[PDB]
Amino acid sequence: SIQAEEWYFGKITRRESERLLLNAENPRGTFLVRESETTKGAYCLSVSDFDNAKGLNVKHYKIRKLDSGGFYITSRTQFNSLQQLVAYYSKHADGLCHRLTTVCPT
Ligand SMILES: O=P(O)(O)Oc1ccccc1
Numbered sequence: 063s064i065q066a067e068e069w070y071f072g073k074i075t076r077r078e079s080e081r082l083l084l085n086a087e088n089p090r091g092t093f094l095v096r097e098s099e100t101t102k103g104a105y106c107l108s109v110s111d112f113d114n115a116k117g118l119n120v121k122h123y124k125i126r127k128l129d130s131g132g133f134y135i136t137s138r139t140q141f142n143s144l145q146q147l148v149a150y151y152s153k154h155a156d157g158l159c160h161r162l163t164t165v166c167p168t
């Protein structure tokens with residue numbers, strides 16, 4: 063189950079995810095998965111980043127799930143589980159701000 067998963071923060075707001083991710087100690091790619099505030103049935107992958115122009119900041123990526131069974135941020139790249147999606151993005155940056163590195167601390 064995903065609610066067992068340490069990176070699944072479940073029902074928390076976008077504002078709260080940003081409060082948690084905007085810690086000067088979080089390296090780029092620090093992340094968590096929460097419920098989407100605006101899309102029913104969807105999740106949201108929240109990720110920290112850092113660069114010389116913007117400093118420490120946060121990105122949000124909607125995760126769709128089909129009753130057909132797939133999970134995805136982009137339909138071009140789907141997975142059989144949310145856990146497999148997290149595993150994949152921890153290895154490949156693709157179009158994200160940075161590959162997933164470490165679970166956001168509480
Ligand atoms: O509104 P949500 O809770 O899905 O969060 C966002 C915000 C911006 C981009 C993707 C998702």
Ligand SMILES: O=P(O)(O)Oc1ccccc1
Binds near residue numbers: 111
């Ligand atoms: O340029 P942004 O601040 O949107 O961050 C990135 C960097 C590369 C890909 C996606 C996001």
